[PDB]
């Protein structure tokens, strides 16, 4: 019975929280208080992750520094308390929130990259020549190969040049100080159209431009390169193209190839016009459209376009290099290169002429788990099974040894890996052998490709580099993930994992096959830091690899301002349920070690502030968690339904596809109005800015996941990869099926897109599997698909609802479930039509738990239609089996500071003269009486409507609890509690911390004990409305 699960949910259905210990400031008192608070809210467990240590926050006097006996004692006490209370625990595989580092790791055991040095020497009899040492992270380096290259031309790779600049932005409403300029350090800055000019003594032949930045700068990659011989007639060379890039893009410079150009003068023209708005695969374009360049280096030696990325040193995608840029003349044949490893100071004999001595080897990338404290150190080598095992043994395994082994064996059931923040890597000591087994040929002779030196042809080079990247991503799965999965089963743990993309070269779906619990992430009020693409990686991964529980780190808030409460979290949560998550993890519960300070310790103001010292914790968090649990009991039932699978291609890196990127492929499915708004948005005219949250200025045409509810207008889709196609896909009854229950009718092979611009050719195997699926009846539409839907092919929309209604559909042996959620902040009445023929629908309310088994419905064209009224932000589940107030005076007690006042009229606290009410945050108890004339009749239902509630209210009538009201409709069923005559009305109203913190900031604190390390505040500088504002009314229905 689904009803037993909805009314009595199982433990799997409960939401969890991340629990962050800050700066080693931890106490047993606070531990007990936190774990009891979590139990009281109805949480299932917590992930215990310490962040930073004493050194990073000396002011807090921490005594529980990571890995000290005192810290381990606190971990033990937490396990003991979680055992007592019936909570489960997880921990991360390292200290801090990312990723797999620790002080036990040496440079040799860390993430490795290919490095090199060179010198030009005359050939002949070389004896005892000392070659320059390549990059050696903390002295660690190891040679791999030494190559001898014949010199192409004989001139310097770079020459000196006189650098000038000029503003050209005319249309004079301009701030003259923000026009182009070069500072003392040679750094170039501009906000306005301009050019930077380089004048050489003699004509210089340039084939590429290395752009060197100080942090990220989208606009630096948008320069238009021009050249001249005579200083006035300038010819176009190339409009540069930004590579796709994530947020961790500063480990390498960027090389832009150009057609070989010989000139005395080069100009780089810039304008902000034509900028793409920001996204997760052009992270730098989220920021202000200002130009900032540390150095442009113009080079002579041929290099592949955007080679740093193509070599796998950083996560990047760009087009193959054109033949106009790298012709066969520009590439070295294998027979031209002499391999001098064996001789290697160097003593050997080369032919005559001049030779380049490319000394190649490997060193650490230098990445650490930087948010750790006592457990901080180098990131483990991600391709080395032993280093990965070692990392497991030294942190996570130790929680079963250093605490209390029998208690740890019962409560510590979850091992987590968060989202990658340790860059990329492209070598390890097993990498040549792995490449050979997997790709079927030897990489070693082609090692100079990893320096972007072209060999044989531009195409052969880039085909090989793609293979390197493919191997890289395969090894993240087959080593790092495989090893941790084995370790997890060995310790009887479930394995949760977040995204690898867009920081480590990877197929972003691929690793989810190895984990029990794929985990996405969604942010609150943080468009610059939100990760909708991560969400779709985790969901798509779970769906294609058959993982039924999909966790999500939810409500992460880049700057929390203390005005947040469950009411304004609901719509955000509901649209992520619509995407397919079904176990929320709250981000974040911060341990507050002091019982006398509130709201206390935070992650330096990064929200959501989800913890015991919230004004609304005791009643608000519990009510919300009840909603969540009921929602999740049903959203974990059976299998998700999606009719459309979309192939993610054969470029590397790769990941799930965002809805926006499919609009030119399926313009019909999205509709003409979506096509039109995308063209306006992407044209990004004037590069408009928005500030959200306070102090975060960014591109206003950023794709906003709130504007992409139900984007395929009644269908759902998963991204789907080569591995799933080749290893798992089956045709059954006209649909493509996978183990775990995915069944798709349609397979979209998208048009070339930003993340797959070539696009990479389909391998013969893929072509062969696609053809088998065409023949077994699977729709593989011709693109662009221009019809409104797939009903011409007998595939109707699953749910027809109006815009701004989020939904999902699950199906199992006991029937069908549609989750339907209003995203607008208004009451709406609308028809929902479901693809269900001849079964009786019911309406199950996840806020109250009420089940209405007898709703009206029509049956038309073999669908079922229902009329729904949804209050602001209201959600429902559709399940298919297989008169004013006349009150006496109010007594209002403000419990935090004991004030009590009498009032006839309801009032906004923030408008009172008394500063202890004006600035009050917390709970106030309202007490009054009312007359009810008649006895409550049969079939008759009575609601106390609260009107406007700031922000949360618990209703007691004649001492009977009639519920905690936190979202619309703001009303309480008082039917069972009503008596004839005089009724007693008690209402507890709770607001948010914002007003009290504003009071405390200004010396007008409404009570003592107010402190937090969270410093961010709303820009508005206003007191929020607060209280039972009403008006109060009764509603008598049937």
Ligand X SMILES: C[C@H]1[C@H](O)[C@@H](O)[C@@H](O)c2nnnn21
Compute the least distance from the CB of residue 206 to ligand X, in Å: 39
Which SS3 state, helix, strand or coil, does residue 370 take?
coil
Helices (H), 880-974: 915-918
**Nearest to residue 798, comparing CAs of 735, 857, 667, 710?**
710
Contact 525, 693 (CB under 8 A): yes
CA dihedral 904, 905, 910, 916 (to 10 degrees): 10
Residue with tokens 């109203």: 989
Q: Does 752 bind Ca ion (CB under 5 A)?
A: no
Minimum distance from residue 29 beta carbon to ligand X (Å): 25
> CA torsion sign, 174 to 176 to 177 to 178?
positive
Q: How far apart are CA 216 and CA 284, in angstroms?
A: 6
Among the listed residues 194, 221, 210, 370, the one whose alpha carbon sits nearest the alpha carbon of residue 284: 221
In which residue are the tokens 């039924």 written?
Answer: 548
Please report where in the chains the tokens 């340790």 appear, as a residue: 422
**754 binds Ca ion per the rule CB under 5 A:** yes
User: By the 8 A CB rule, do 179 and 192 touch?
Assistant: yes
Distances (CA, A) of 697 to 42, 231, 286, 1030: 38, 39, 9, 37
> In angstroms, what is the minimal distance from the CB of 503 to ligand X?
10
Nearer to Ca ion, 87 or 755 (CB): 755
| Span 144-203, contacts to Ca ion by CB under 5 A | none
Q: Are 303 and 256 in contact (CB under 8 A)?
A: no
Nearer to ligand X, 553 or 874 (CB): 553
CB of 615 to ligand X, least distance (A): 23
Instruction: State the minimum distance, in angstroms, from the CB of residue 554 to ligand X.
Output: 11
Q: Which stretch binds Ca ion (CB under 5 A): 121-129, 486-494, 518-526, 1028-1036?
A: 518-526
Greatest pairwise CA separation for the chain in angstroms: 114
**Could you give the C-alpha distances from 146 to 118, 583, 1015, in angstroms and in order?**
10, 53, 55
556 binds, among Ca ion, ligand X, none (CB under 5 to 8 A by kind): ligand X
For Ca ion, which is the closer residue by CB, 585 or 818? 585
* Residue 1013 interaction partner, one of ligand X, Ca ion, none, beta carbon < 5-8 Å per kind: none
CA-to-CA distance for 837 and 859, rounded, in angstroms? Answer: 7
Identify what 755 binds: ligand X, Ca ion, none; CB under 5 to 8 Å per kind: Ca ion
* Residue 100 Cβ vs Ca ion, minimum distance, rounded to whole Å: 14
Name the one range near Ca ion by CB under 5 A: 173-181, 481-489, 751-759, 892-900.
751-759
Which of residues 94 and 755 has its CB atom nearest to Ca ion in the complex?
755
Cα 248 from Cα 421, distance rounded (Å): 7
**Whats the size of the chain, residue-wise?**
1038
Pick the closer one to Ca ion by CB: 729 or 755.
755
Q: Which is nearer to Ca ion, 99 or 114 (CB)?
A: 99
Our CB check for Ca ion shows the closer of 498 and 874 to be 498
Q: Which residues contact 683 (CB under 8 A, 6 or more apart)?
A: none
- Of 419 and 822, the one with the shorter C-beta distance to Ca ion is 419
What is the smallest separation between the CB atom of 508 and ligand X, expressed in angstroms? 15
- Of 599 and 649, which has the nearer Cβ to ligand X? 599
Residue 496 in the binding site for Ca ion (CB under 5 A): no
- Binds 359: which of ligand X, Ca ion, none (CB < 5-8 Å by kind): none
Q: How far is the CB of 497 from Ca ion (least distance, A)?
A: 11
- Taking the complex as a whole, how short is the minimal distance between the CB of residue 701 and Ca ion, in angstroms? 17
For 554, the 3-state DSSP assignment is strand
Q: How far is the CB of 18 from ligand X (least distance, A)?
A: 7
* C-alpha dist (Å) from residue 153 to 120, 300, 355, 594: 12, 9, 11, 70
Shorter beta-carbon distance to ligand X: residue 65 or 556 = 556
Residues 249-268 that bind Ca ion (CB under 5 A): none
753 binds, among ligand X, Ca ion, none (CB under 5 to 8 A by kind): Ca ion
Is residue 753 within the footprint of Ca ion (CB under 5 A)?
Answer: yes
Kindly report the CA angle at 1036 between 886 and 842, in degrees rounded to 5? 145
529 makes contact with Ca ion (CB under 5 A): no
CB of 531 to ligand X, least distance (A): 8
Residues after which the chain is broken (C–N above 2.5 A) are: 344, 882
Closest residue by Cα to residue 568 from 507, 531, 525:
525
Residue 590's nearest CA partner among 599, 579, 581 is 599
Cis peptide before 292 (omega within 30 of 0): no
Q: What's the closest the beta carbon of residue 956 comes to ligand X, in angstroms?
A: 38
Sign of CA dihedral 907, 912, 916, 920: positive
- Where in 648-667 is the site for Ca ion (CB under 5 A)? 649, 661
Backbone angles phi, psi at 287, to 5 degrees: -90, 170
What, of Ca ion, ligand X, none, does residue 109 touch, CB below 5 to 8 Å by kind? none
Burial class (CB in 10 A: 0-12, 13-18, 19+), 195: buried
Q: How far is the CB of 376 from Ca ion (least distance, A)?
A: 18
Q: Of the two residues 452 and 649, which places its CB atom closer to Ca ion in the complex? A: 649
Q: Strand pairing of 88-92 and 412-417?
A: parallel
Interface positions with ligand X (CB under 6 A): 97-98, 418-419, 529, 553, 556, 587, 606
The nearer residue to ligand X, 585 or 819, going by C-beta atoms, is 585
Query: What's the distance, CA 81 to chain centroid?
Result: 32
If the CB atoms of residues 47 and 383 are measured against ligand X, the closer one turns out to be 47
Minimum separation from the CB atom of position 17 to ligand X (A): 12
Which residue shows structure tokens 């509901």? 574
Work out what residue 606 binds among ligand X, Ca ion, none; the CB cut-off runs from 5 to 8 Å by kind. ligand X
Report the residue number, 191 or 419, with the smaller CB distance to ligand X. 419
Give which of Ca ion, ligand X, none residue 817 binds (C-beta under 5 to 8 Å, depending on kind). none
- Indicate the SS3 state at residue 95: coil
- With beta carbons less than 8 A apart as the criterion, state whether 922 and 895 touch: yes
Partner touching 649 among ligand X, Ca ion, none, CB below 5 to 8 Å by kind: Ca ion
User: Rule CB under 5 A: is residue 755 a binding residue for Ca ion?
Assistant: yes
With CB under 5 to 8 Å by kind, the binding choice for 305 among ligand X, Ca ion, none is none
Nearer to ligand X among residue 46 and residue 967 (C-beta): 46
Pick from Ca ion, ligand X, none: which does 754 bind, CB < 5 to 8 A by kind? Ca ion
Q: Is 366 helix (H, G, I), strand (E, B) or coil?
A: coil
Give whichever of 308 and 418 is closer to ligand X, judged by the CB atom: 418
Sort strands 551-556 and 517-523 into parallel, antiparallel or unpaired.
parallel
Which lies closer to Ca ion via its Cβ, residue 666 or residue 952?
666
Q: Which does 736 bind (CB under 5 to 8 A by kind): Ca ion, ligand X, none?
A: none
Whether the upstream peptide bond of residue 653 has omega within 30° of 0, thus cis, is yes
The whole-angstrom distance between residue 489's C-alpha and the CA centroid of its chain comes to 27
Q: Which does 567 bind (CB under 5 to 8 A by kind): ligand X, Ca ion, none?
A: none
Closest by CA to 662, choosing from 644, 643, 650, 687, is 644
What residue 75 binds from ligand X, Ca ion, none (CB within 5 to 8 A, per partner kind)? none
Shortest spacing between CB 473 and Ca ion, in angstroms: 17
Of the candidates 811, 803, 809, 847, the residue with the CA atom closest to the CA atom of residue 828: 803
Instruction: Note the helical H segments in 422-531.
Output: 431-439, 458-475, 482-490
- Cα 697 from chain centre: 19
Contact range with Ca ion by CB under 5 A, out of 190-198, 410-418, 881-889, 968-976: 410-418
Q: Which of 419, 424, 633, 983 binds Ca ion (CB under 5 A)?
A: 419
> Judged by CB under 5 A, how many residues of this single chain contact Ca ion?
8
Task: Tell me how far, at minimum, the Cβ of 718 lies from ligand X, in Å.
Answer: 23
The one of ligand X, Ca ion, none whose footprint includes residue 219, by CB under 5 to 8 A per kind, is none
Q: How far is the CB of 556 from ligand X (least distance, A)?
A: 6
Which stretches of the chain bind Ca ion, using CB under 5 A? 418-419, 521, 649, 661, 753-755
């Amino acid at each position: 019975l689904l009803r037993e699960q909805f009314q009595n949910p199982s433990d799997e259905a409960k939401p969890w929280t991340f629990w962050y210990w800050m700066f080693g400031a931890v106490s047993k008192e606070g531990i007990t208080a936190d774990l009891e608070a979590m139990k009281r809210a109805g949480l299932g467990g917590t992930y215990l992750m310490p962040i930073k240590g004493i050194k990073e926050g000396p002011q807090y006097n921490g005594k529980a520094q990571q890995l000290t006996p005192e810290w381990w004692e606190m971990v033990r006490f937490s396990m003991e308390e979680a055992d007592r209370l019936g909570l489960k625990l997880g921990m991360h595989i390292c200290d801090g929130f990312a990723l797999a580092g620790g002080p036990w790791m040496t440079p040799k055991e860390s993430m490795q990259k290919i490095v090199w040095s060179d010198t030009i020497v005359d050939g002949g009899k070389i004896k005892g020549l000392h070659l320059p040492q390549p990059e050696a992270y903390e002295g660690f380096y190891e040679d791999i190969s030494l190559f001898a290259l014949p010199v192409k031309e004989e001139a310097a790779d770079v020459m000196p040049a006189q650098i000038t600049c000029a503003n050209i932005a005319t249309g004079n409403h301009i701030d003259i100080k923000k026009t182009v300029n070069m500072d003392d350090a040679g750094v170039i800055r501009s906000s306005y159209p301009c050019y930077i000019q380089y004048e050489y003594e003699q004509p210089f032949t340039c084939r590429n431009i290395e752009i060197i930045l100080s942090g990220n700068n989208y606009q630096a990659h948008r320069l238009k390169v021009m050249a001249s011989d005579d200083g006035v007639n300038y010819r176009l060379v190339k409009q540069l193209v930004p590579a796709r890039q994530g947020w961790q893009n500063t480990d390498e410079n960027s090389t832009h190839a150009i057609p070989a150009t010989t000139a005395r003068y080069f100009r780089f023209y810039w304008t902000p016009e034509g900028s793409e708005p920001g996204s997760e695969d052009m992270d730098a374009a989220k920021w202000k459209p200002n130009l900032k360049i540390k150095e442009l280096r113009l080079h002579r030696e041929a290099r592949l376009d955007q080679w740093e990325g193509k070599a796998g040193l950083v996560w990047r995608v760009a087009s193959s290099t054109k033949k106009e840029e790298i012709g066969e003349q520009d590439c070295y044949a294998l027979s031209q290169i002499i391999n001098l490893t064996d001789p290697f100071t160097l003593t050997a004999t080369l032919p005559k002429g001049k030779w380049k001595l490319l000394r190649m080897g490997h060193t650490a990338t230098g990445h650490t788990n930087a948010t750790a404290g006592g457990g901080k150190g180098l990131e483990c080598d991600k391709f080395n099974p032993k280093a990965v095992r070692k990392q497991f043994d030294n942190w996570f395994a130790q929680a079963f040894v250093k605490t209390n082994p029998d208690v740890a064996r019962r409560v510590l059931k979850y091992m987590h890996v968060d989202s990658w923040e340790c860059g990329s890597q492209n070598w390890s000591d097993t990498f040549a052998a792995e490449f050979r087994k997997r790709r079927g040929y030897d990489l070693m002779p082609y090692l100079p490709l990893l320096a972007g030196i072209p060999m044989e042809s531009a195409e052969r080079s880039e085909k090989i580099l793609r293979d390197v990247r493919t191997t890289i991503g395969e090894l993240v799965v087959d080593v790092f993930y495989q090893v941790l999965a084995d370790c997890a089963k060995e310790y009887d743990c479930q394995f949760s994992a977040e995204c690898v993309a867009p920081t480590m070269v990877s197929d972003g779906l691929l690793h989810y096959q190895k984990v029990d619990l794929p985990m996405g992430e969604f942010w609150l009020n943080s468009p610059t830091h939100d990760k909708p693409n991560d969400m779709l990686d985790a969901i798509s991964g779970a769906h294609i690899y058959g993982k039924n529980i999909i966790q999500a780190e939810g409500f992460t808030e880049v700057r929390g301002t203390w005005n947040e409460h469950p009411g304004i979290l609901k719509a955000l949560l509901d649209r992520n349920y619509a995407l397919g998550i079904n176990r929320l993890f709250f981000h974040v519960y911060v341990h507050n070690p002091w019982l006398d300070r509130k709201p206390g310790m935070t992650l330096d103001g990064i929200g959501l502030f989800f913890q015991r010292d919230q004004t609304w914790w005791n009643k608000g968090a519990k009510a919300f968690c009840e909603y969540i649990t009921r929602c999740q009991s049903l959203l974990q039932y059976g299998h998700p339904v999606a009719d459309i699978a979309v192939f993610t291609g054969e470029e590397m890196p790769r990941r799930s596809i965002l809805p926006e990127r499919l609009v030119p492929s399926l313009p019909g499915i999205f509709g003409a109005e979506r096509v039109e708004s995308e063209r306006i948005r992407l044209a990004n005219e004037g590069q408009p800015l928005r500030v959200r949250p306070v102090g975060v200025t960014h591109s206003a045409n950023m794709s906003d996941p709130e504007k992409w509810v139900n984007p395929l207008r009644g269908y759902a889709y998963d991204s789907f990869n080569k591995d799933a196609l080749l290893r798992l896909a089956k045709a059954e009854n006209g649909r493509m099926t996978l183990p775990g229950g995915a069944s798709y009718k349609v397979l979209v092979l998208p048009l070339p897109r930003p993340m797959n611009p070539d696009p990479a050719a389909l391998s013969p195997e893929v072509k062969q599997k696609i053809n088998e699926l065409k023949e077994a009846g699977i729709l593989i539409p011709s693109l662009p698909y221009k019809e409104d839907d797939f009903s011409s092919y007998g595939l109707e929309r699953d749910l027809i609802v109006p815009e701004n209604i989020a939904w999902t559909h699950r199906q199992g042996e006991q029937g069908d479930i549609y989750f339907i959620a209003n995203q607008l902040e208004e009451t709406r009445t609308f028809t929902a039509s479901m693809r269900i023929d001849g079964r009786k629908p019911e309406c199950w309310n996840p806020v109250t738990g009420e089940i209405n088994a007898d709703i009206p419905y029509e049956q038309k064209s073999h669908r079922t239609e229902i009329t729904l009224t949804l209050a602001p932000n209201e959600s429902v589940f559709i399940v298919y089996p297989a008169t004013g107030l006349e009150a006496t005076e109010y007594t209002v007690t403000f419990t935090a500071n004991g004030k009590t006042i009498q009032r006839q009229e309801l009032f906004d606290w923030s408008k009172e003269e008394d500063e202890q009410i004006r600035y009050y945050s917390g709970t106030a108890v309202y007490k009054t009486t009312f007359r009810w004339k008649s006895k409550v009749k049969e079939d008759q239902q009575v609601y106390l409507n609260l009107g406007k509630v700031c922000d949360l209210a618990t209703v007691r009538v004649n001492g009977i609890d009639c519920g905690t009201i936190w979202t619309a409709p703001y009303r309480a069923d008082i039917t069972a509690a009503l008596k004839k005559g005089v009724n007693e009305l008690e209402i507890e109203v709770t607001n948010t911390w914002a007003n009290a913190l504003k009071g405390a900031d200004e010396g007008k604190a409404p009570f003592d004990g107010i402190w937090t390390n969270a410093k961010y505040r709303r820009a508005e500088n206003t007191l929020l409305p607060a209280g039972l504002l009403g008006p109060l009314n009764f509603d008598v229905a049937n």
